């Protein structure tokens, strides 16, 4: 029937209770617009709707409502690439519409047939400090957290850039025989910062194989958490129907959590753990679940999500369960960034769990994850042996403390800094591993086999 | 239309909403105070009334202005003193003998008083006008027109009724738009919801700066007009005191400043000393005060207001930013603003977020810095416009980790810190190299490179001295002097020189507080080619005390370069620098020899 | 009494920065962490039962 | 209508929705007791009230209700000085009547009749150490904050009495011509301590000047409110109608923020962080915007709000939210107060944002905002130099550091130690204020011109 009330952007009808989940409804407004909602609950001859559009600017029994019959789906197609898109997919442009192919559900995975053979394939990104550190593979989900007041969106501009540039030599090793797409979702992302992606698009020859999704804080937030969803059915259309690894870059983490956190007190729930939703678990496992390998085991979607930490610390609940669904982290340290490294990619936490799991052989030493234990073991004691300098002094430091100080600046300055226009090789960086790690005696270097030990220092 | 069902507190139930937006603004009851419909269950809406209550009775009637919470915003801004919702406060001062509205009473927005004279833009009788397109334009200061008249947005259309020009009142219609049948009448101002932004085109990268000429500013963190820029604060420990500072400096198109929610004292003091200050443009008729237009809110008046304050102030700049003006929004503070959002969160009865603050809060921050930026002007002329908010924050809860500032450190991309020792010095802003930081550095250092400055070099070169002298301080502590030479020596030398002719400044000369893109560019020239030149000296034998005394009257013409006039070399081109690279070289060989 | 000079000072820079590295930032990180959860106990206390 | 019930503070009436809000109703017991109460919420065919004396004893149907017809208003006269009343606006002389001229609405005005001007003129409180350090001005508000390891009442009291033997000598310096008031409101006061307050302004010959408005801690919440509305009323009628400077003592805002916290603002609804509203600003901000100065522009209130800090905290709300809308404060200390300093006032963690800018130059010297320069930073010094001593000795002690080692001591014992009854005035407290910068030689005062040191010294 009419709006009976309506609190925030949830609009309470009375409407008749036989409309299915997930149905669009349409508002008729005697403002002369009609504005679409997806039913968030159905109840005994009344629902609880989000509208789409607006957030005010509803009537209470002057308004009427019409219904779809279909439930929220998103017209999917492969024609969508090449286009500029906002957070509900129309173009911006203003040209010919998303279109469809297929409608694919938000509302629950599709097809659900991720992973039975584990990612162990390495991904190349043009970066050291990223690929040696911490392993990449196809369907791996390795998150970058950085901290308010960072460059989190020029580091994510670096690894797209380079990854594809890379790419045909690492066709020749294998790591690629199929098409490669980036799938680009913002929320909360300033108009410059967007407008920086796209030139780095350009840069690649991927500009014409991405989709680009722009939600603003300044669009309603209904829209801003559809923006992700939205973003993963396009990603995996792709990487099912012809086979094709897309790399999905999602920024920022914090920015759809703060969406959750205002559809929480318009809700009745409860919110738990520091003010944020106590079904926040939920809301980050959806989108996590859809990554691995799909159907054919030549498609996948890769993930790097992007995450700011709102207050700066890594015990806050949002890096804490989404660093335990994912596989890894990635730490980028406020000190490294002002002291004017590139990338500040800090690996004292720094790690990912498929190490011995994402390598093989023919494109990878197995020798590669071993090389890593080194390099993160040494980077740690020398980062402690820094730590006791700064106290004590050097007069007073052992001689393993020395070595280790010496370690670490050697790190700083040759590993984690290179160019922003610079692509590395998996070989190339464990070669630069073995000078840098040549400064301890063979006593001290014991994180590694004697036999690979006794080539290679 | 309603009917009060409920009073609890200053939240008011009225039932019998039989159609109602949930934005509407309404007067309730036959007090008429000021409300907002919040929510709505039923018949019966939640308001919140943002004045006291105390008189009003259950069974009252509630009338619907018949329109959402809108400003108007027209000619004769300029000059005038405002609240949020928008009350002229001079006004009140003539009629009721206060500056504070009286409640249950409300007065015209904009003033009736004022008449401007309109001449026609250039489409005529008969022609098709189109979003954002100039129909004519208005003066809005008697020395200066800065308010052109574009067609409302959304709309479009042949313009069937076109005034000739005269002076006409804000009260009467001047044109009538036929697209649909008469599709309304049109006035010299026009309206638009505070919550709603006006648009553009499309929006730019912000590459061009802010005009305010302060030489610390401009150089080494380079100001961005079309940015978001955060700066702290604890109230009256030198933030209100750079508020004010960057009002006189500046000589933007139009600068509108925001009071959130401050102490009153701050806000009166804004008003008095704008008119007797000077615009560093040259321009006359009440200088700084001709081109500010107030929304000044201390915190003791109605809570709509604070909260409307931000609103109202980034419409207002964005129409501007349409006209094709560059705009200084200057807001002090958002720390308020979001108390403003908590205490009314508190009343209603629904559940505040982290830290007491409500769920809302993050999107409506976070809303308002991305609408301020340079953007293109929506129509056919493209005109090009900028808003560059400085926001203001202080601790809140007494804690400066808590959620609102660092959320807001997350979105900016310019940070200029405050420090109590460094403004006792007379350093504004007080900054050093790492309680500041600037990202729009890098393409604002490619923009003044190119209009003729060696610019990008010599920056990088100003951030890398300080970071040193510092540095070289320390060891002096721990490590004694045996770690130090002469060669260092120089190197605390050049950056106390910098400090004290780019960071320390109070305005003690006109020249003092403007100082062009070239000006500036000429200071770091003399500083860093002494800097090379003497360590070159004392390596082919030369001590420290001895440069010192050597470098001296050039070393005190260039200190002195901030009380010389900038128009000695023409008009923005400092002869005395050109002059200071032969000095430099015959000096060379004083030094070394 | 030089040579004994020459020994005390080394002990008394070690502790100067002994505090300024180890201890504050350690005091930092504690104390945010329990002001934190200790007003989250406040806040939901108060949700749970208004709802 | 009979009475429904009460829970707790809140009583319900089932009486009719006829009375209108601030709407005074009569509790009619079969006891011969009438009380009266304020309806904080008119609603349909109920209303609650809380009563303004007691809550229980109560029926619910030998209990009446009738509705009086005139709403919350103080009668506001100037016979009112001298004037001895409760927290209802009822006396406690047990003689006459109030008195009226006009009935005025308690509420931070109906009108609101104040205007924004910069404060410019000096107030003078009696003690050197509040006026030359963090100096007082028409229209500014500067808190004392105190803490429960004073004696907070005590030193409040010592204020408030030496304040209005302030105006003669202001009479000859020119800067008030036009009479001194006091308008005192005592919240949540003891008895004995209630009667200290009285003596110490019959003693002073204040008497005369000052009214107070008395809330006892036995009185309910819901009076202790009303209490500070008729104090600031009464001022706002001196202050615009007869052009008086008005001082106002607010002590102690602290009981103030119980009867909110407790209920009046929590009344059953969601209150923020440690029990304290989140709009407990909102209600600071009434009694704020009911100070300043007024038409007449010889008209004026001062206000001098006393918090008193649970334990001394920083990060309670009460000092916080309070500390924000003033500008500036006074901060006391519980470590003088053991040395045997009266009244123990610290002036280095105080702060008065706006001190020469704030006062006048007429009836205070030009030196001031210059001396309060020096005494600061040696004050500052002096506290790091004590201790110093005390490990250093005197043999290898600075010269500097000595010289303000014994500047602490005095700064305490003289400037910041006086009687009970000793008053000075502004340009004595000046005087002491060279003298005891007198001791270092001018190389040590460097902060300040030659002209104004050689003159002042």
Redesign the interface.
């Known amino acids: 029937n009419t709006v009976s009330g309506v609190n925030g952007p949830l609009v309470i009808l009375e409407k008749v209770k036989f409309p299915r989940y997930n149905e669009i409804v349409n508002l008729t407004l005697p403002d002369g617009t009609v504005r679409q909602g997806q039913v968030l609950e159905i109840r005994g001859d009344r629902a609880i709707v989000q509208v789409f559009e607006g957030t005010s600017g509803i009537d209470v029994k002057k308004t009427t409502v019409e219904f779809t019959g279909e439930s929220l789906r998103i017209p999917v197609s492969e024609d969508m690439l090449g286009r500029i898109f906002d957070g509900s997919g129309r173009p911006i442009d203003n040209g010919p519409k998303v279109f469809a192919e297929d409608y694919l559900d938000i509302n629950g995975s599709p097809i659900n047939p991720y992973a039975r053979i584990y990612p162990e394939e390495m991904i190349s990104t043009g970066v050291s400090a990223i690929d040696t550190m911490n392993s990449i593979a196809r369907g791996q989900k390795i998150p970058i957290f950085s901290a308010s007041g960072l460059p989190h969106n020029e580091i994510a501009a670096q690894i797209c850039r380079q990854a594809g540039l890379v790419r045909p030599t690492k066709d020749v090793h294998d790591g690629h025989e199929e098409n490669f797409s980036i799938v680009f979702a913002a929320m909360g992302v300033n108009l410059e910062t967007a407008r920086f992606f796209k030139q780095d698009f350009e840069e690649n020859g991927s500009l014409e194989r991405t989709s680009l999704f722009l939600n603003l804080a300044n669009d309603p937030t209904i829209e801003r958490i559809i923006t992700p969803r939205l973003a993963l059915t396009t990603a995996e259309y792709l990487a099912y129907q012809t086979e094709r690894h897309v790399l999905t870059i999602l920024t920022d983490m914090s920015s759809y959590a703060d969406a959750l956190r205002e559809v929480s007190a318009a809700r009745?729930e409860?919110?738990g753990?520091?003010?944020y939703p106590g079904y926040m678990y939920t809301d980050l496992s959806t989108i996590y679940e859809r990554a691995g390998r799909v159907e054919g085991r030549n498609g996948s979607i890769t993930q790097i999500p992007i995450l700011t930490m709102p207050n700066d610390?890594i015990?806050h609940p949002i890096p804490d369960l989404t660093g335990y669904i994912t596989e890894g982290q990635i730490f980028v340290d406020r000190q490294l960034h002002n002291k004017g490294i590139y990338p500040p990619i800090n690996v004292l936490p720094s790690l990912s769990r498929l190490m011995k799991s994402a390598i093989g052989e023919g494109m990878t030493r197995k020798d590669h994850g071993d090389v890593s234990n080194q390099l993160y073991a040494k980077y740690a004691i020398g980062k402690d042996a820094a730590?006791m300098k700064?106290?004590?002094?050097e007069?007073?430091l052992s001689i393993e403390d020395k070595l280790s100080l010496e370690f670490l600046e050697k790190f700083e300055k040759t590993f984690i800094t290179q160019g922003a226009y610079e692509d590395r090789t998996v070989f190339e960086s464990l070669d630069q591993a073995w000078s840098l790690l040549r400064i301890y005696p063979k006593e001290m270097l014991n994180r590694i086999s004697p036999k690979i030990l006794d080539e290679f220092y | 239309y309603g009917a009060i069902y409920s009073v609890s507190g200053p939240v008011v139930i009225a039932e019998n909403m039989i159609g109602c937006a949930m934005y509407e603004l309404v007067k309730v009851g036959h007090d008429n105070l000021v409300g907002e419909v919040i929510r709505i269950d039923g018949d019966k809406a939640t308001i919140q009334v943002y004045e006291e209550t105390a008189g009003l009775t259950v069974g009252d009637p509630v009338l619907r202005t018949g329109k959402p919470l809108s400003v108007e915003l027209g000619p004769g801004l300029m000059e005038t003193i405002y609240d949020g919702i928008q009350r002229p406060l001079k006004a009140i001062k003539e009629e009721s003998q206060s500056i504070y509205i009286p409640r249950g009473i409300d007065t015209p927005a904009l003033d009736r008083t004022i008449k401007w004279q309109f001449t026609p833009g250039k489409f005529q009788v008969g022609d098709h006008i189109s979003g954002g397109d100039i129909y004519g334009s208005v003066f809005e200061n008697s020395l200066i027109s800065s308010h052109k008249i574009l067609l409302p947005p959304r709309s479009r259309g042949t313009i069937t009724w076109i005034a000739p020009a005269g002076e006409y009142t804000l009260d009467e219609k001047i044109l009538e738009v036929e697209f649909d049948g008469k599709k309304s009448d049109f006035t010299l101002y026009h309206t638009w919801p505070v919550r709603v932004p006006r648009p553009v085109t499309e929006k730019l990268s912000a590459d061009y700066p802010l005009l305010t000429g302060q030489r610390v500013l401009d150089a080494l963190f380079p100001c961005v007009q079309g940015g978001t820029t955060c700066i702290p604060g604890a109230f009256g420990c030198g933030k209100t005191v750079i508020s004010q500072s960057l009002s006189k400096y500046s000589n933007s198109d139009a600068i509108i400043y925001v009071g959130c929610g401050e102490r009153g004292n701050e806000m009166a003091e804004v008003l008095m000393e704008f008119p007797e200050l000077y615009t560093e443009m040259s321009g006359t008729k009440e200088p700084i005060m001709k081109r500010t237009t107030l929304v000044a809110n201390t915190s003791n008046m109605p809570v709509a207001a604070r909260e409307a304050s931000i609103y109202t102030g980034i419409t207002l700049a964005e129409y501007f930013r349409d006209q094709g003006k560059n705009v200084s929004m200057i807001a002090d503070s958002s720390s308020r603003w979001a108390e403003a959002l908590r205490e009314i969160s508190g009343r209603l009865?629904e559940?505040?977020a982290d830290?007491?603050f409500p769920a809302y809060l993050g999107a409506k921050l976070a809303s308002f810095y991305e609408r301020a930026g340079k953007a293109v002007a929506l129509g056919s002329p493209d005109r090009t416009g900028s808003v560059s908010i400085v926001a203001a924050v202080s601790p809140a809860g007494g804690?400066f980790?808590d959620p609102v500032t660092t959320a807001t450190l997350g979105i900016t991309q310019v940070f200029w810190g405050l420090d109590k020792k460094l403004a006792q010095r007379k350093h504004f802003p007080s900054i050093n190299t790492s309680v500041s930081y600037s990202k729009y550095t890098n393409v604002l250092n490619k923009f003044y490179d190119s209009n003729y400055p060696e610019f990008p070099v010599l920056r990088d070169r100003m951030k890398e001295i300080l970071s040193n002298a510092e540095e070289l301080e320390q060891v002096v502590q721990?490590v004694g002097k045996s770690a130090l030479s002469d060669s260092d020596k120089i190197t605390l030398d050049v950056a106390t020189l910098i400090k004290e002719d780019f960071l320390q400044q109070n305005g003690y000369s006109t020249y003092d507080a403007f100082c062009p893109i070239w000006k500036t560019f000429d200071m770091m020239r003399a500083f860093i080619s002494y800097h090379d030149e003497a360590q070159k000296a004392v390596a082919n034998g030369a001590n420290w005390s001895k440069l010192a005394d050597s470098t001296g009257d050039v070393k005190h013409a260039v200190s002195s370069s901030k009380f010389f006039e900038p128009s000695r070399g023409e008009k923005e081109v400092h002869g005395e620098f050109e002059k200071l690279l032969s000095t430099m070289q015959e000096r060379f060989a004083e030094s070394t020899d | 009494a030089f040579i004994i000079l020459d020994e005390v000072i080394?002990v008394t820079?070690?502790r100067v920065?002994?505090i300024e590295?180890?201890i504050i930032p350690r005091t930092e990180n504690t104390i945010?962490?329990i002001?934190?959860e200790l007003?989250?106990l406040?806040?939901?206390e108060?949700?749970?039962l208004?709802?």
Request: charged share 35%; hydrophobic share 25%.
């Open positions: 009745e409860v919110p753990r520091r003010g610390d015990t730590a700064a106290v004590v002094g007069e007073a | 009865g559940m505040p830290q007491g804690d980790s721990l | 080394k820079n070690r920065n002994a590295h180890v945010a962490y002001n934190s007003d989250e406040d806040r939901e108060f949700y749970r208004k709802k």
